[PDB]
Known about the structure:
Strand order of the largest sheet of chain A: 1-2
Structural class of chain A: little secondary structure
Shape of chain A: rod-shaped
Distance between the termini of chain A: 43 Å
Radius of gyration of chain A: 19 Å
Order of helices and strands of chain A: EEH
Oligomer: part of a larger assembly
Largest interface: A-B, 6 and 7 residues
Number of strands of chain A: 2
Helix content of chain A: under 10%
Amino acid sequence: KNLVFQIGANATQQISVNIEDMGADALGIKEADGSIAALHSVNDLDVTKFA
Amino acid sequence: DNAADCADIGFDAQLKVVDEAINQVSSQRAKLGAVQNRLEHTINNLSASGE
């Protein structure tokens, strides 16, 4: 779903846009790796694991 | 569904249709006006020769 824009009054004169963040987005291994690299942002391992 | 690439649903076919359509308008209008030129100068020869 490329969030293109249209610019030229003629054809093909477009732009490409990239928007990817989410609260489940953190350290970019590839994706939400596991409990880490996305979900310390979400789940926050500092409960008692961090003790 | 698409805006660039499928060549039928991608802005470029479409805007091209509008473009050449308007150019058909242009061409025919030029023909009509050419006829009007011929009819003006024609009435001039008719009117003065006839005179």
